[PDB]
Design a protein around this ligand. Sequence first.
Ligand SMILES: C[N@+]12CC[C@H](CC1)[C@H](OC(=O)C(O)(c1ccccc1)c1ccccc1)C2
Ligand SMILES: C[N@+]12CC[C@H](CC1)[C@H](OC(=O)C(O)(c1ccccc1)c1ccccc1)C2
Lengths: 234, 236
Amino acid sequence: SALRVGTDGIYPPHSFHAQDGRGELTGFDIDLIKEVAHRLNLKVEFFETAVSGLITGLDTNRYDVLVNVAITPERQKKYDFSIPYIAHRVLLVVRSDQQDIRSFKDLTDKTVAQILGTDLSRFAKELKSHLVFSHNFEQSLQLLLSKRTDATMIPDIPFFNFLERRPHDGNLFKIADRMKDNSAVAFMMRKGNNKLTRSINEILCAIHLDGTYKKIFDRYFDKNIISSVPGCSS
Amino acid sequence: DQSALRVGTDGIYPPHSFHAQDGRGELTGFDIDLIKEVAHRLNLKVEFFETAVSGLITGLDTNRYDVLVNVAITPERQKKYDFSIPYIAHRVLLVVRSDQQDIRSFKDLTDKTVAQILGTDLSRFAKELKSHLVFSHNFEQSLQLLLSKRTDATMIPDIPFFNFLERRPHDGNLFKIADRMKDNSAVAFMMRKGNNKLTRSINEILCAIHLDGTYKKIFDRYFDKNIISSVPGCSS
Ligand SMILES: C[N@+]12CC[C@H](CC1)[C@H](OC(=O)C(O)(c1ccccc1)c1ccccc1)C2
Ligand SMILES: C[N@+]12CC[C@H](CC1)[C@H](OC(=O)C(O)(c1ccccc1)c1ccccc1)C2
């Protein structure tokens, strides 16, 4: 019957509410999982939760799938993932006037804005940055803009979304560094949920093959900036 | 390396899987080096079984081995087998002789003679296009059938075709690419359905191999990163 999906509806263009937060859930990952669910003959139900609680919610069995999850070996050990459906690259973003920060290594004893309970937040911790925890990507950039923090590490997808939405507020940023590799992103389910995993994968390959994915992708991304994943065949 | 990972392969397909010293030595290739690598990190030793392409799936089905390499992900295969996270991607090309005029797309292959390997999806696609098939033993023979005018076309992934130009460059000018699939294709290891633990393990190890530079090393050993596409990395 239902596909229970955990998400946080304040992260454009992944997952957000239409009409400036007033309307239904929308976004790339939302449109895709809605699509997956329709083909599997399921009604989708979304549960809204802060990012810091999303994995906790999946562990607690409040829902069955998470969207927009970076594949890591730690997570691979402990959860099931679909085939990757997108890829992002991590950027170090500073204000355009910033001088002292040129690499990830320079973040030590700088104030950095990150989201509580994320890998980037943990990376910031290991670097011995001074963390300021923001509720989302919009607030990270806003903290940076108003000089409350000196840097943020942010995937390319939300950062470019921000420049698209607020362009004349965009040239106030510079990219100081980027990870050498881009990162596979997939749906995450609990381990030992193999049937649902195979099903999503089946359907994702169908969505590659019939042009639906290109439509959902073009709806949200500039294929000149945002990387995708290899297709499926027949 | 005191318990075995049984791998089915055909060792006449450079640069995926082939024998060193012009076919006379140990099994080698991108897919071979990667699965060997996977197996060492899993504390297994690898055992390879060589089989003609037409028989590989049957061997996995009858339990003579546990994994096939270089397998394109298809929804039919997804329905019936387990796959790892994609570790490479190829693109299908239509290759013709450089002088060829009448072939501009896949659709033009109807009633053309085409060279393909028996028991491949491209062979079945050739069938459906109402082409006249000449069955070759491998990619080298497909290109050779084309070269000597026994066939008019072959459909070949980019990876072996470019390997061929690397090995025999002075023969490069005899071929042209008439068309390519609009999408590239994910390629993975294929296991039998039901062994989820081995699947997760390979995936774990592949992501580790992304992260420590080993994948870059194996890839650069075999491919031109300006021609051949790869898959996104992992994070941590
Ligand atoms: C590097 N890292 C590590 C943890 C996480 C995945 C990748 C994080 O990114 C995120 O903020 C989420 O992907 C997210 C983003 C928008 C909407 C919903 C969720 C997320 C966070 C924690 C758990 C799952 C997803 C940055
Ligand atoms: C695009 N496509 C579709 C059908 C098939 C899988 C991928 C074919 O490629 C192959 O010849 C094999 O991948 C192969 C190649 C070299 C060494 C070992 C195996 C293969 C053939 C049959 C069954 C599994 C793999 C081309």
